[PDB]
Amino acid sequence: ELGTSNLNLDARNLLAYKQTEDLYHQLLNYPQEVISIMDQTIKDCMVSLIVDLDEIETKFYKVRPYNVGSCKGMRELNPNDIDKLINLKGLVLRSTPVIPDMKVAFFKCNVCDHTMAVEIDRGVIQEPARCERIDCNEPNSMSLIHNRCSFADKQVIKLQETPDFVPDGQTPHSISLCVYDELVDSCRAGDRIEVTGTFRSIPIRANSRQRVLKSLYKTYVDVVHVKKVQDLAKIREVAAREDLYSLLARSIAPSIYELEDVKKGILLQLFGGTNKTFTKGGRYRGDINILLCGDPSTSKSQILQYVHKITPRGVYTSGGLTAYITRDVDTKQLVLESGALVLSDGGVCCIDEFDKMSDSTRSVLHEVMEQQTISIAKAGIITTLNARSSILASANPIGSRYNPNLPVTENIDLPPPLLS
Amino acid sequence: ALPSIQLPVDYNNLFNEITDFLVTFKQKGPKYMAMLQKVANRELNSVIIDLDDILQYQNEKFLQGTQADDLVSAIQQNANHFTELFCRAIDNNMPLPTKEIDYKDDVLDVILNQRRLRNERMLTELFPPNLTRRYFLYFKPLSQNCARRYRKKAISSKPLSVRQIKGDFLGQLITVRGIITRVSDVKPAVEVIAYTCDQCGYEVFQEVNSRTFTPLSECTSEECSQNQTKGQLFMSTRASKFSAFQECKIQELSQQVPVGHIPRSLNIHVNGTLVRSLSPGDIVDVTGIFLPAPYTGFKALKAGLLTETYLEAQFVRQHKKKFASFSLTSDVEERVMELITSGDVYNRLAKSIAPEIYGNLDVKKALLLLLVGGVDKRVGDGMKIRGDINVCLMGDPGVAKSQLLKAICKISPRGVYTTGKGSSGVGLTAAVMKDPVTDEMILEGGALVLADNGICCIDEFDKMDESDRTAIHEVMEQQTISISKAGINTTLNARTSILAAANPLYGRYNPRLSPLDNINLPAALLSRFDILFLMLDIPSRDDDEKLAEHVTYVHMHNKQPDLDFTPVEPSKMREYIAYAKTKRPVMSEAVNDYVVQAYIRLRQDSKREMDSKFSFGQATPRTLLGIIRLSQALAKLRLADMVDIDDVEEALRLVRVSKESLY
Ligand SMILES: Nc1ncnc2c1ncn2[C@@H]1O[C@H](COP(=O)(O)OP(=O)(O)OP(=O)(O)O)[C@@H](O)[C@H]1O
Ligand SMILES: Nc1ncnc2c1ncn2[C@@H]1O[C@H](COP(=O)(O)OP(=O)(O)O)[C@@H](O)[C@H]1O
């Protein structure tokens, strides 16, 4: 009734049956053949159960087995476990662009403009030495066409072990990963995932000019499974409560004692104002910016962390924050990277230790609040970027205490206009 | 062509003697029969041969006039050939399995059984033995007392240094000693490589021992040997045999290097079940075979006779020491019973840490309370509390605070010493930067040196630049390190105690306002620390006399003096600190009023902080948190699961004495 093509399959339920545990063990030994015959069986089972036959002949069927065995780490991988199913947990380090993979060749007899399709296997292609048309039958008239073939999307993922496997301050190890089709782009940088797949080994070409091969084989894992690590009616019931303001203000900071007014202000600025861009006058700022000052005995960083994690979008930084052209590390190319302030579009940008802000970056803030659009002109790139972000900062007075007699300006050491 | 020479060595009699020894040896019956039987039942995975057994067997059989030659000498002069002879002899006399076997799991044997049921059904290839072998052959060096048992100089052993090995030792069996610095990962290596033949009968096999391998192009299958090809041969990963491979290097010790020289290195290869038996940073003595390696891998067409050399591991003694993770044993149980019978212990432990430095009992007591840790493992709702204590030591140069720091670092297994620059790969960066030969750029991002449950010790805490100071500001109060450079966010969960030793930049105390000296560091960092202790050098006759007498008595004996009286020993307290951390007492409620009134009187003191000239008595809730943590530690170090008011009193006295040194 859905039209999709996807099956989930747990091993423990597969293990609960006495005949199936034999199939369990045989799946452990021979993954590829078992998976292929299982997919063929499901392809037959669809038709066996529907007894529209038109949507079936277009789609394929695949399984996604999981929980076959306990998760193993890169620190214990014997060569005895080659071509067997294992489960891994780890953190994604880096991804790669989609790699086209040859599946069907397309040749053409240039003399007679005749084309034929040739299948391949194991990557190696058996080139035909003569055109099939015996009317011409020339041997050297066959030429490959690159852009009229069929391809598959291969992608390589780099994975690192979880830090819990290193008890004595050793360094983590990295294992390469491979994915196909629906598994492409399913993980990004910093993602914590668990995968299920078979093990593999491959020879190294060494010198590309000759046919010499190294005595050591590189190891990589091919996977078939990944996992990560009407409510509006309830809103209006709460929205009709008279004292919702006080409860909502006090809910943000459960451990903070008193300080009710600042909590109300922070909640209200989290709510945010309106934004309008009428043509004849120009846009008006809708962001709210708040500054906190006091001696370092107020737990004012706890409120910063509270607002950072509560808000949908927001970056928590300290005293670089904007876009700058960078030289890519692993690949020798030039990439434009956006800063922390740009990343907080529509959210709350949290700044800690605002006094030690240097001098070059402060003017940047003087540019980002009054116009909410930062421009850059470096390396031949001239452009303007939108920020539209809210600022919430904390500052400390100069000295062990803030003397009430002295006015605020001297103690914080900030420019009068920026405070204004 | 090749001229011939005569040698006094003939291998037939040696092989016969090997078989006779392996069959007849009596040390249960024959040991060498029982171990082979266990190998047959798929129980053992490696074979170790003791040369002392062969030596003693030959010595005791020489009493009858039958033996003519010696075999251990030939083993010393050549090893790999005897390894081949031993594996042939073992495969010749392999016993029958006396136990049941889970025969279905052996995929290699199932594949070979299928191949046989194909080939011999039509009436078959003699598979090489190394493909069918499952065990590994290892050797064990002799013992010097065994050599002393007889007149002969069958010594070997003698763990030569890296530089003491010269060119004429190639091919023999030698023992090296040193420190392991680099250990590579585990990577599978081929031993027998098999090709599938595309249903063309038998699957051709190939064997390579060199580090460079070349594949096949055409096969000897009879229908493939026909005048036209039948399928292209392909390498099959399932049928071939593999072996774990690992390589490391070893450094010479600082003792053995002659003056004015730079220590050398030596590569080492390990294969089989001995993989992962060594770790970086330990003293070992490896026994193995010293073998040459061709220089043709570099492919420069130079060095016509120059070649590289490496060692092949056979047997390793880990040596060094073992922390053992305070694994419970009877002996240490009676040891802790003795400690319990010893009564009050903390003063003795303080006395027993550094007898070389005289006096200074407060700092030793503070170090002892630091070694246990404060209250930890969170509170309700998830609020963060850190059990590590952050104490800083203030004093003028020439007070041996650096010596005490070295002592506490040595006695604490987790201690680490750092300083401002001098080495760059110690702060704000990990030790795996640009390390691999591929320059894979392995990195965690923002991390420190063993910051998890570590004891960071720093001398000249005013010296380091802005980077390390910002790192400390990031580590304040178990805060995670979240510095990113290339999209990485692998934060290191920093939970460490901070040990800081520094001096005012004037190098001496002053009669004027004391915060003017402080640490010449921001006051925010100063307020973070739990205990500030000042060591001021006051010229006094009755104290400097005792200090001088103690130091000169230490010097006179060229050893630790008997003037000290410590019933406890450094290893004794090393065990007891883990024992006391294991007990882990929890808090009690009846002290809340006492600590609240103590905090009230501390705020009363803060009412007089403007009296100045020792203005360090400022107001901070972290003072209350620190006094709670110190009371918890004063319940942890010696007491059972109970927190006493006397602990709070002792913590208060410690704080008062720490402030008292200001004057
Ligand atoms: N009380 C003491 N008992 C024994 N030796 C002492 C004592 N005080 C200082 N020393 C001697 O001081 C030397 C080490 O102290 P050191 O000068 O390193 O201290 P420091 O205060 O950390 O100074 P610096 O920063 O200049 O190194 C040793 O030779 C040690 O014998
Ligand atoms: N009213 C309070 N309630 C709870 N904790 C507090 C309170 N005041 C201070 N603290 C504690 O004291 C610390 C104050 O540090 P803080 O001033 O936030 O450092 P920073 O210099 O980064 O602002 C906090 O970590 C908090 O645990």
Ligand SMILES: [Mg+2]
């Ligand atoms: Mg010093």
Ligand SMILES: [Zn+2]
């Ligand atoms: Zn043609």
Ligand SMILES: [Zn+2]
């Ligand atoms: Zn063939």
